[PDB]
């Protein structure tokens, strides 16, 4: 798994621990998604992404990982009981 500075900074604010993420991913895939990001969304390299992604966890308590790069692209806010799951996520 690759965790950038952004995700690392979000972790404590969204109720996630290093172990929380490792344990969630170890439990196995629970859904799929996609990582589409225009070049402008990824400075300073500006490479962008167009890759399949895998989801781990459950509604409101999940992590999305880029299948090619191994990058964590999204972690839900566990402190928000009303978090609405990303529309691209397909459970199952």
């Amino acid at each position: 798994l690759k965790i950038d500075q952004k995700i690392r900074g979000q972790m404590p604010e969204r109720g996630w621990t290093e172990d929380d993420i490792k344990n969630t991913v170890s439990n196995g895939a629970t859904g799929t998604s996609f990582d589409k990001r225009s070049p402008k969304k990824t400075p300073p390299d500006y490479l962008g992404r167009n890759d399949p992604a895998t989801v781990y966890g459950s509604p409101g308590k999940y992590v999305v990982v880029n299948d090619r790069t191994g990058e964590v692209t999204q972690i839900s806010d566990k402190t928000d009981p009303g978090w609405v799951d990303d529309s691209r996520i397909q459970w199952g």
């Binding site: 225009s38 609405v84 990303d86």
Partner: protein, 106 residues
């Protein structure tokens, strides 16, 4: 949390007063205000997540996620970081996004 997840904050000041880093839902206007305050405070903007406010409820759209890892010598690059962050929010507004969550290095 010091703020409410059921509220779409419309003032950048709320972000700092209520410690909303990486979590508070911000209106487009508030998001821009937070970016300007960040520059004034000398803080690097690590990321901006865009989505839609469902009144209530926030639904993130991963395709709107903006990320900018902080370089070692970053102080001279804050103006660029700030410029790109604001430009990003403006572009998302053109694409119909109605809520943002900002992550600062602090």
């Amino acid at each position: 949390k010091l703020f409410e997840h059921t509220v779409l904050y419309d003032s950048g000041d709320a972000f700092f007063e209520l410690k909303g880093n990486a979590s508070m839902k911000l209106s487009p206007k508030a998001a821009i205000e937070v970016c300007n305050e960040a520059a004034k405070k000398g803080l690097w903007i690590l990321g901006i997540d865009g989505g839609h406010w469902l009144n209530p409820g926030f639904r993130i759209d991963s395709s709107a996620s903006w990320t900018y890892d902080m370089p070692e010598e970053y102080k001279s690059k804050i103006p660029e970081n700030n410029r790109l962050a604001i430009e990003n929010i403006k572009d998302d507004i053109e694409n119909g996004y109605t809520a943002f969550i900002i992550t600062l290095k602090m």
